[PDB]
Amino acid sequence: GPETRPGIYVLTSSIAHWQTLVDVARGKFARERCSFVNRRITRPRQIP
Amino acid sequence: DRQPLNPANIEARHHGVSDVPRLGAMDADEPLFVDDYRATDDEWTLQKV
Amino acid sequence: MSLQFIGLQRRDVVALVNFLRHLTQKPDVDLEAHPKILKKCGEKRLHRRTVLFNELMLWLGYYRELRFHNPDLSSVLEEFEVRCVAVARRGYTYPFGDRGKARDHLAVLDRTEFDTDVRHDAEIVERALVSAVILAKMSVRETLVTAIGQTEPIAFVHLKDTEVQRIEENLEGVRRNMFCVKPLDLNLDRHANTALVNAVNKLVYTGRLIMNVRRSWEELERKCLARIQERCKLLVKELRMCLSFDSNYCRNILKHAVENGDSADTLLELLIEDFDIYVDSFPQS
Amino acid sequence: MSLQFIGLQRRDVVALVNFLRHLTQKPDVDLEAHPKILKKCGEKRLHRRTVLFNELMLWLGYYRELRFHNPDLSSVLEEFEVRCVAVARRGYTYPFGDRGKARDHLAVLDRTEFDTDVRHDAEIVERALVSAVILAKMSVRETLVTAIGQTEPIAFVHLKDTEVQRIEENLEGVRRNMFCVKPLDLNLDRHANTALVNAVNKLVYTGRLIMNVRRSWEELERKCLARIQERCKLLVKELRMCLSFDSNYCRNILKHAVENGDSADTLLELLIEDFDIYVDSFPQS
Amino acid sequence: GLFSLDRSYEEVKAAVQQLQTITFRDATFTIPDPVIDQHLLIDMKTACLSMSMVANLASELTMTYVRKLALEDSSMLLVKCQELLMRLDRERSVGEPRTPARPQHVSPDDEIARLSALFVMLRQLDDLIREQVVFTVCDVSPDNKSATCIFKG
């Protein structure tokens, strides 16, 4: 609501190609990803 | 018949009063007739036994 | 502006004027549904010319009253839109054997609307009920049609065969009497049926109530025109049989096209305002 | 074609049928709200069998009119879901001192939907109202009850005490006369209040308006069945007191279960069509 | 370029003047208008339409693809994605098209071509989408006359 509260991460990984790299992140961070779309339908004019 | 009996409007019965429409409904596949359930799930199991 | 007649007695005029004031209240709204009104014209009793004029006054007055009362069913049409949305919302909580196949019939039902063009309404209710009646079959697990080109005809589901015979009699009267609808005494709601199915059965009756009116109004409004167009093919030839100023003046009155009822209204009031001059053209008494 | 009666005078017969034709117009609809109508049945003054039978023609005719009308919720209940979703957007906008507490209520409110079963609908609304009224206190940080098992009662927040009486008073009419709704022209909006608060007031008002139509309906539909079943426990024993063709004939009629209202309509339609054969059994005049 | 068409209204006439004047650290600058003599240059028209295609062709085409993939409820967000397409701000009441509008009566082959017409606009648009780095400065000389920069790309 009032503000984003970002976290920080450092991720060693055997993956090198950018396409396969982001795909695994789409799973582990799907919880925040659900918050991302949820804020969009919640707050028009606001553009996270 | 090929059509399901699922709607409940097809089923109705009566006792002790003259039923020309029911007695004339004989042999015809529909409407078919089923009595109000004296049956219970425990007694229903025994008929299969 | 009131209808005029030639040789008719005043008692016959009372029979006709009362028919217009009571035309909505009278069962079965059709001039051919009341043959005795045609007997008031005095056909065969009088000359062939006089019968053609009095009949024209009847059909134009039978037509103008339909233009007056105006089947404004838009109020009842709004109720069909509300009961339509009531059906689809119930189905989201009920699992089906193929949720994607069911949702395709839901989304089309939720797009329902009524454009200003009246001609679409015959197709609006039809395309909606086909998305609705098939949806009721899925919850009951009754087989739906699979062959191409074999859309299911609309019909009430989960009702006694005696009950369908009763409600059809009520829709049968609306086809003959589109004005004063009389509500049924046998409600379609049933405790035995799934509550969504009762929303569908009322949705069909709201659909049949509207489609019968738009269809019957499409016929009688068109049927009156052909009955009037024959008079131009008849009354004009009778004026050709004898030439006099009264017989000649009527020939130009019929020059207006019967087509388009707005132009046809000019054919009536102009015929009435000038009635005094050609009254002698038709023999009487 | 119409409900039958035994010893009633013709003036009493028309008076009862008119009570059903005007039943929605009469304030505070209940058979016990009009005690004199039970005196019109012929209590005490007539033979005891005549009273029990005519009362059976009342409750079966009273319950049948309830099916014939049935308080539709297709209009306001859809408006309730829209105003409910509107609260879900405004609820996220307001900062809280405990983000995890307000999320627990709004996550439940987002999932609101109506099952096809109608009896569960009162449970649907109340879980959304308790979720909302608890949130309304957090907007002003008023102390909600913390005791386990107490369950905070539904109540409007931050309104004039006279307005709190006017708003609840209309619900008392919804709990008595559910048919002819006459919504208040008064606004629930308060410019001094947060828009999140006023949205709850429009939400709780419709939320009480939905449950009150259902609970008062379920209170009648449940009561109507038990009142008929008590007549069967007594009237059948009276037929046992004197064996006869018509007396044993009636025993078969009541043999069918009173359960389910669809059966009750079948119980009435047969009893009227065959009423003539056994009318002699009941003394009158 | 989105405002290259409308111009007579004062609101657009001023809003372009604000975008024309960038303001940043130290010196400020002004960005020349691509538009000249009312009519737009062909390059911006090819680019502005490339966004206009994706902004509109994506609308109807994505409707069928959301409803089917959302049935799994895996990440659950796809159900919220289905209502994302209604495109509105105010909580609209009882107009009764709560579901997003969907394509109808599309030709079975032309539906494939519409997807081919989609991504091809993205390829023409791609040059504006990205900015490859070419240098990364480290230390900077005084008066900013020059600076060392490791090469990139």
| Region of residue C21 (phi > 0: left; psi between -120 and 50: alpha; otherwise: beta) | alpha
Task: State the structure-solving technique.
Answer: cryo-EM
Cβ–Cβ < 8 Å for C173, C182: yes
Cβ contact D92–A42 (<8 Å): yes
* The two three-digit tokens of residue D278, written as one number: 């056994």
C81 touches chain E (CB under 8 A): yes
Chain C residues near residue B8 by CB distance under 8 angstroms: 158, 190, 192-193
Which of D78, D116, D260 lies nearest to residue C191, judging by beta carbons?
Answer: D260
Q: How far apart are CA E69 and CA D273, in angstroms?
A: 58
The two structure tokens encoding residue D13: 């017969």
Residues ≥6 apart with Cβ < 8 Å to D208: D129, D154, D171, D174
List the beta strands (DSSP E) in E31-110.
Answer: none
3-state class (DSSP) for residue E137? strand
Return the DSSP state at E144: G
Query: How far is residue E139's CA from residue A27's CA, in Å, rounded to a whole number?
Result: 40
Tokens matching residue D195? 């828009």
The C-alpha atoms of residue C282 and residue C46 are separated, in whole angstroms, by 10
**Residue D6 CB neighbour total at 10 angstroms:** 20
Residue numbers in D near A42 (CB within 8 A): 89, 92-93
Interface of C with D (CB under 8 A): 82-83, 85-86, 89-94, 185, 187, 189-192, 194-196
Neighbouring residues of E73: CB distance < 8 A, sequence distance ≥ 6: E79
Resolution in A: 3.9
Helix (H, G, I), strand (E, B) or coil at B30: coil
Place of tokens 């059709």: C30
Nearest CA in chain B to D256: B36
Q: Do chains E and C touch (3 or more CB pairs under 8 A)?
A: yes
Q: Which residues of B touch D274 (CB under 8 A)?
A: 17
Quick check: E102 and C107 CB within 8 A?
Answer: yes
CA dist C163 and A38 (Å) reads: 50
Q: Among B3, B7, B30, select the one facing C158 at the smallest CB separation.
A: B7
Give Dmax over CA atoms of chain C in angstroms. Answer: 82
CA distance D69 to D26: 14
Closest residue on chain D to E94 (Cα): D79
Q: How far is CA C214 from CA C23, C203, D20, in A?
A: 19, 17, 34
Helix, strand, or coil (residue C106): helix
- Is A40 exposed, middle or buried, given 0-12, 13-18 or 19+ CB atoms closer than 10 A? middle
CB contact under 8 A, D83 and E94: no
Q: Nearest CA to CA, how far is A13 from chain D (Å)?
A: 33
How many pairs of residues across B and C have Cβ atoms under 8 Å apart? 29
Using CB atoms within 10 A of its CB, is residue C164 exposed (0-12), middle (13-18) or buried (19+)?
middle
Q: Among E94, E96, E99, which would you mutate to test the D interface (most chain D Cβ atoms within 10 Å of its Cβ)?
A: E94
Instruction: Say how far apart CA D123 and CA D232 lie, in whole Å.
Output: 33
H or E element that contains C107 = helix C99-110
Task: Say if residues C90 and D114 touch (Cβ distance below 8 Å).
Answer: yes
Q: Dihedrals φ, ψ of D151, to 5°? A: 60, 110
Q: Residue D105 to residues A41, D127, D134, D158, D251: CA-CA distances in angstroms?
A: 18, 10, 8, 20, 56
Cβ pair A42:D94 closer than 8 A: no
Interface probe for A, chosen from E79, E80, E91 (most Cβ of A below 10 Å), is E80
| D-interface mutation test, from A35, A40, A42, A46, most D Cβ less than 10 A away | A42
Contact call for residues C200 and C138 (beta carbons, < 8 A): no
Q: CA distances (Å), D180 to each of B18, D20, D155, E125, in order?
A: 44, 15, 25, 61
CB neighbours of residue C250 within 10 Å: 20
Radius of gyration of chain A (CA): 14
Question: Are A34 and E76 within 8 A, CB to CB?
Answer: yes
Q: Is C169 within 8 Å of C64 (Cβ atoms)?
A: no
What is the Cα gyration radius of chain B?
A: 14
What is the C-alpha separation between E71 and D147, in angstroms, rounded? 41
Q: Does C101 touch chain E (CB under 8 A)?
A: no
Q: How far apart are CA E101 and CA E113, in angstroms?
A: 21
Q: What whole-number distance in Å separates Cα of residue D91 and Cα of residue D105?
A: 10
Q: How many Å lie between the alpha carbon of A15 and the closest alpha carbon of chain E?
A: 21
DSSP state of D111: T
CB atoms within 10 A of CB E117: 13
Nearest to C203 by CA among C134, C151, C272: C134
Q: Which helix (H) or strand (E) segment is D92 a member of?
A: helix D76-93
C178 by Cβ neighbours in 10 Å (0-12 / 13-18 / 19+) ranks as buried
Contact D99 A43 (CB under 8 A): no
Q: Which positions 230-259 of C are in contact with E (Cβ < 8 Å)?
A: none
Residues with Cβ within 8 Å of D15's Cβ and at least 6 positions away in sequence, in order, are: D40
d(CA C196, CA D116): 6
Q: Are D212 and D168 in contact (CB under 8 A)?
A: no
Long-range contacts of E97-103 (CB under 8 A, 24+ apart): E97/C110, E97/C111, E97/C113, E98/C110, E99/C106, E99/C107, E99/C110, E99/C111, E100/E63, E101/C111, E101/E60, E101/E63, E102/C107, E102/C111, E102/E60, E102/E63, E102/E64, E102/E67, E103/E60, E103/E61, E103/E63, E103/E64
Touching D: E residues 86-115, CB under 8 Å: 91, 93-94
* Residue A23, C-beta contacts closer than 8 angstroms, at least 6 positions apart: none
Please judge whether D95 and A42 are an interchain contact, meaning their C-beta atoms are less than 8 angstroms apart.
Answer: no
